[PDB]
Coordinates of C-alpha atoms in Angstrom, one line a residue:
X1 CA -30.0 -12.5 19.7
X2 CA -26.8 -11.1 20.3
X3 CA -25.4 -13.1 17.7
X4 CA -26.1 -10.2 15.4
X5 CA -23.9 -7.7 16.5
X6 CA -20.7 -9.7 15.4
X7 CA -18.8 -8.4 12.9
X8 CA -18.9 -10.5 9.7
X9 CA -22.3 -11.8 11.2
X10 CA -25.9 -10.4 10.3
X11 CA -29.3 -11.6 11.0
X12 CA -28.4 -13.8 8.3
X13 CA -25.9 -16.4 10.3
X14 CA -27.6 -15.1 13.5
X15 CA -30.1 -18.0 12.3
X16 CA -28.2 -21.0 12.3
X17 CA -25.3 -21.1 15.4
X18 CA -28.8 -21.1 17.0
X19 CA -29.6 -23.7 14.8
X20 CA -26.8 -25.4 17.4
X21 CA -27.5 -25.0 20.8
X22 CA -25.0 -22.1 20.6
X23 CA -26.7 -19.0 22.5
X24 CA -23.2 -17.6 23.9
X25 CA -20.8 -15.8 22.3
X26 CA -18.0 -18.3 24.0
X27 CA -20.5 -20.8 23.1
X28 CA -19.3 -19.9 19.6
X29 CA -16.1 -18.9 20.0
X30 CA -15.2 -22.3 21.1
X31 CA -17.4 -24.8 19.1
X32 CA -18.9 -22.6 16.1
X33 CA -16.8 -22.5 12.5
X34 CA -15.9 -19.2 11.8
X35 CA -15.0 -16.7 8.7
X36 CA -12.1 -14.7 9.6
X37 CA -13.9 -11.4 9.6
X38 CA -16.4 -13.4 11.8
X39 CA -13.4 -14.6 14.6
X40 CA -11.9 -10.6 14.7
X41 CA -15.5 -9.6 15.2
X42 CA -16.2 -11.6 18.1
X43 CA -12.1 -10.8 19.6
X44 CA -13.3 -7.1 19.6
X45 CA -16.9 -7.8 20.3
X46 CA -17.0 -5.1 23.0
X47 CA -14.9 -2.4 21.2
X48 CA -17.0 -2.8 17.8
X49 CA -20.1 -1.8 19.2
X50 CA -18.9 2.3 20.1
X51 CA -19.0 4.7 17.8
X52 CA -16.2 7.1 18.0
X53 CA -15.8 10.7 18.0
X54 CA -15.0 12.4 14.9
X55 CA -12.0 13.7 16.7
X56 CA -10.6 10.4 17.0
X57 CA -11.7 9.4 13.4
X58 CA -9.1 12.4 12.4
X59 CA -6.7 10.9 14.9
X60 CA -7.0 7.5 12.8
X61 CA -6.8 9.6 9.6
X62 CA -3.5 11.5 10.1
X63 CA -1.6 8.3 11.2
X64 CA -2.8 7.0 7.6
X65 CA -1.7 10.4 6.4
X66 CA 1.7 10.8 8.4
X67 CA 2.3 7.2 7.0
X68 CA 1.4 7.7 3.5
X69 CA 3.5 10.8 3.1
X70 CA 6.6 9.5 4.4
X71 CA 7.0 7.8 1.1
X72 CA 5.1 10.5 -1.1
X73 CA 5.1 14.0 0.4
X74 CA 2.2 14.8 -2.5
X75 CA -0.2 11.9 -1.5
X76 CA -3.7 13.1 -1.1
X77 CA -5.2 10.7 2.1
X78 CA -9.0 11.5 3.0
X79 CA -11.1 9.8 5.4
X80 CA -14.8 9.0 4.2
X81 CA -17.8 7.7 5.1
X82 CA -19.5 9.4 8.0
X83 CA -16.6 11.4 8.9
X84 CA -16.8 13.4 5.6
X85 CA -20.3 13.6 6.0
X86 CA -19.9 15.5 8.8
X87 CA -21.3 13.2 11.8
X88 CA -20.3 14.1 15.4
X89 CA -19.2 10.0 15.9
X90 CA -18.2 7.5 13.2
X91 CA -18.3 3.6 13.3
X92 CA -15.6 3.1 11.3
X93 CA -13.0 4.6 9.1
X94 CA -12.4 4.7 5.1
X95 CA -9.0 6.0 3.9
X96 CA -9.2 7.3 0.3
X97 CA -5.3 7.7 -1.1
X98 CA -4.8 9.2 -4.8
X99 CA -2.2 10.9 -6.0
X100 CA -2.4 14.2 -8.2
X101 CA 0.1 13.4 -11.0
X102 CA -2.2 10.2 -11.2
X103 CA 0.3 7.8 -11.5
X104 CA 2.7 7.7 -8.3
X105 CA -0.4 6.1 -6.4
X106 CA 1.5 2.9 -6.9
X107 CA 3.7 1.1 -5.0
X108 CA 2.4 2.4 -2.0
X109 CA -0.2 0.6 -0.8
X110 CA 1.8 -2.7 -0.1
X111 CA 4.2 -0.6 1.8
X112 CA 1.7 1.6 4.1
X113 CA 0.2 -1.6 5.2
X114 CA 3.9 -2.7 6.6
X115 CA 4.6 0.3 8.0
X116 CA 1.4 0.6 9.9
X117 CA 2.0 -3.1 10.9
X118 CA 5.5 -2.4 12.7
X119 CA 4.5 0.7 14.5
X120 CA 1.4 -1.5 16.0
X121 CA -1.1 0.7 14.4
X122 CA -2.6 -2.2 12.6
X123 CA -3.7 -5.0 14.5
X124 CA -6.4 -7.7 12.8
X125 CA -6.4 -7.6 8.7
X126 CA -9.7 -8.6 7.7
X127 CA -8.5 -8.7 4.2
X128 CA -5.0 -7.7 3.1
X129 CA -5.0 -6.8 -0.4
X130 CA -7.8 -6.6 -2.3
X131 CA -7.5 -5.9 -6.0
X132 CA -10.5 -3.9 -7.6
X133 CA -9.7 -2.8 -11.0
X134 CA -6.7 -0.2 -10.6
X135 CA -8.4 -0.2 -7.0
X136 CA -6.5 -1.5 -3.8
X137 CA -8.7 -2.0 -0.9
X138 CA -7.6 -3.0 3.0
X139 CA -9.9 -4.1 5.4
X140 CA -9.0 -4.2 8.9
X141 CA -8.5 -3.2 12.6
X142 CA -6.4 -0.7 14.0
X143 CA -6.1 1.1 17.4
X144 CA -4.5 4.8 18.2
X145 CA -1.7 4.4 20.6
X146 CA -1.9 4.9 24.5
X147 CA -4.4 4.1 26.9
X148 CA -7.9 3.3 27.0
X149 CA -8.0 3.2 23.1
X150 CA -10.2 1.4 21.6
X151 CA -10.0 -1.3 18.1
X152 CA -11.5 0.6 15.2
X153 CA -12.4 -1.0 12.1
X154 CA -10.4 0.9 9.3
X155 CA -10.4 0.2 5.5
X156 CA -7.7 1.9 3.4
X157 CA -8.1 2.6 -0.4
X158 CA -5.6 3.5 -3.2
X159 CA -7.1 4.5 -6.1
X160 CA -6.0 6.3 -9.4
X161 CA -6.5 10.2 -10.0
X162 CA -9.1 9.9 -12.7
X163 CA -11.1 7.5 -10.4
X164 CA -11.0 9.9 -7.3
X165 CA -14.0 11.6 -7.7
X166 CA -15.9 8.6 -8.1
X167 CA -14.0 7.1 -5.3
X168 CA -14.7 10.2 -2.8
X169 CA -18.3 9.9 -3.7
X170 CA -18.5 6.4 -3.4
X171 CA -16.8 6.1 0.1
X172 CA -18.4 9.0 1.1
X173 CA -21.8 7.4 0.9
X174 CA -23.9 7.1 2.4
X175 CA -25.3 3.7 1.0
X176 CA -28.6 4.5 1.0
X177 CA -27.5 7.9 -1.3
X178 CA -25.7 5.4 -3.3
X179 CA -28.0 3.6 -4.2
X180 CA -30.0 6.6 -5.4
X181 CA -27.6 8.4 -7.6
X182 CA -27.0 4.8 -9.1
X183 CA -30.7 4.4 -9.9
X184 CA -30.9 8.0 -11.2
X185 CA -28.1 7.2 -13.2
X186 CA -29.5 4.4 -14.1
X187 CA -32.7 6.6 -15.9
X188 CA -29.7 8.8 -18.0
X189 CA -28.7 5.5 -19.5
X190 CA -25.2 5.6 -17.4
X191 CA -24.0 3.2 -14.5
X192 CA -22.2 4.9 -11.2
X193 CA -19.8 3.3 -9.5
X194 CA -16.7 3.3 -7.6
X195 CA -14.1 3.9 -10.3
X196 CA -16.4 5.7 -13.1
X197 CA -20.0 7.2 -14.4
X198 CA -20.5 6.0 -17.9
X199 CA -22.8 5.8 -20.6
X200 CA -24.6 2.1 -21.9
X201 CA -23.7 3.1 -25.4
X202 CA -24.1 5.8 -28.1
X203 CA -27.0 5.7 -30.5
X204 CA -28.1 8.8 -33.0
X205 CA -31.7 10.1 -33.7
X206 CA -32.7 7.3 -36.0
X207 CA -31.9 4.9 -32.8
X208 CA -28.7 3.5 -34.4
X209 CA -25.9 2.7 -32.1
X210 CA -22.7 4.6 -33.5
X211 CA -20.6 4.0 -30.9
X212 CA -19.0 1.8 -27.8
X213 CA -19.9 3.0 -23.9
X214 CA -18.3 6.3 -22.7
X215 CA -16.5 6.7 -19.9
X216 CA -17.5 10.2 -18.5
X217 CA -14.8 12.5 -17.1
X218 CA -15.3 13.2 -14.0
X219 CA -12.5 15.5 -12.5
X220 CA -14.7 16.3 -9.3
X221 CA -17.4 15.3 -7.2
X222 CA -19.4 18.3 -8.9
X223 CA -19.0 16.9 -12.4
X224 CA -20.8 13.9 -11.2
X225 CA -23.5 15.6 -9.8
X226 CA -23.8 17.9 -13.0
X227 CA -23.7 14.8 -15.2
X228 CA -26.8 13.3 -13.3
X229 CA -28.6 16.2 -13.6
X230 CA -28.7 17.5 -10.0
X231 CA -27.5 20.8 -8.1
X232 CA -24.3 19.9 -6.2
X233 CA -24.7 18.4 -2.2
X234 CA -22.2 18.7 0.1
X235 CA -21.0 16.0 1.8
X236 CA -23.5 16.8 5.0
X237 CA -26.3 16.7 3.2
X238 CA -25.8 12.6 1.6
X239 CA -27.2 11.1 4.4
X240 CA -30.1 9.6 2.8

């Protein structure tokens, strides 16, 4: 069942394609329907099942960087995931782009993508734009110029100042520490996710509600952490 392994593709389809007599990844390049996450999974089949080393994850990271600044010399790019946790080979790549002043985040992402496109950096977009609140997320492919490189899956995020923290965390991961900062969240009254912690409401002593939900500043990844009540972990130490 090597169905699974496509990109776009879990154990979920990996159940059906089967259904057909399909048992070859040509079998289904040529006769299956695809998604198009599902057809750029299967065109970089090979590539998509190598981790790379972090060194290369910064590689990817400062093109995003090099790129970003060219328009905005004060535009903060981080890479997330596994790289910021600190692993010794990533299997794919989050960008993270803010801006301090908070506000000169936009405009940019439309025009990063293009430039990343003409240099050849960019090679499959899974998904173009994608608009999340004051959130814009690219999913995609790229590949570091030369030989012998590789396609790496990269997504790319712009995302307000106020929301960075939140972001960082959130990109950061991993999912399994996600989900636990969102249940223990969940037992303060307040709901973590990618743009914001906030409270359900505000109710006094007597159990009245005297006001709406609050968004909680959260300036830094330690506020959030102080917020929910725990002593501040590095990035190396969110792996479960």
């Amino acid at each position: 069942e090597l169905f699974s392994n496509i990109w776009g593709a879990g154990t979920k389809t990996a159940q059906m394609w089967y259904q057909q007599g399909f048992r070859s990844l040509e079998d289904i390049r040529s006769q299956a329907s695809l998604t198009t996450q599902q057809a750029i999974g299967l065109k970089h089949y090979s590539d998509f099942l190598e981790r790379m080393p972090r060194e290369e994850a910064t590689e990817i990271e400062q093109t995003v960087q090099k790129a970003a600044q060219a328009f905005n010399s004060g535009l903060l790019c981080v890479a997330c995931g596994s790289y910021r946790r600190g692993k010794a080979t990533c299997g794919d790549v989050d960008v993270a782009i803010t801006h301090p002043d908070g506000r000169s985040h936009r405009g940019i992402f439309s025009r990063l993508l293009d430039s990343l496109r003409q240099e050849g950096f960019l090679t499959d977009d899974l998904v173009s734009q994608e608009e999340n609140g004051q959130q814009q997320k690219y999913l995609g492919v790229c590949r570091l110029p030369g030989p012998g490189r590789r396609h790496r899956r990269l997504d790319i995020i712009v995302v307000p100042y106020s929301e960075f923290a939140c972001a960082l965390l959130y990109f950061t991961g991993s999912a399994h520490f996600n989900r636990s900062m969102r249940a223990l969240a969940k037992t303060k009254g307040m709901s973590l996710s990618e743009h914001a912690l906030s409270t359900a409401v505000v109710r006094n002593t007597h159990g009245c509600k005297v006001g709406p939900g609050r968004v909680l500043p959260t300036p830094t990844e330690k506020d959030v952490f102080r917020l929910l009540g725990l002593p501040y972990r590095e990035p190396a130490e969110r792996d479960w």
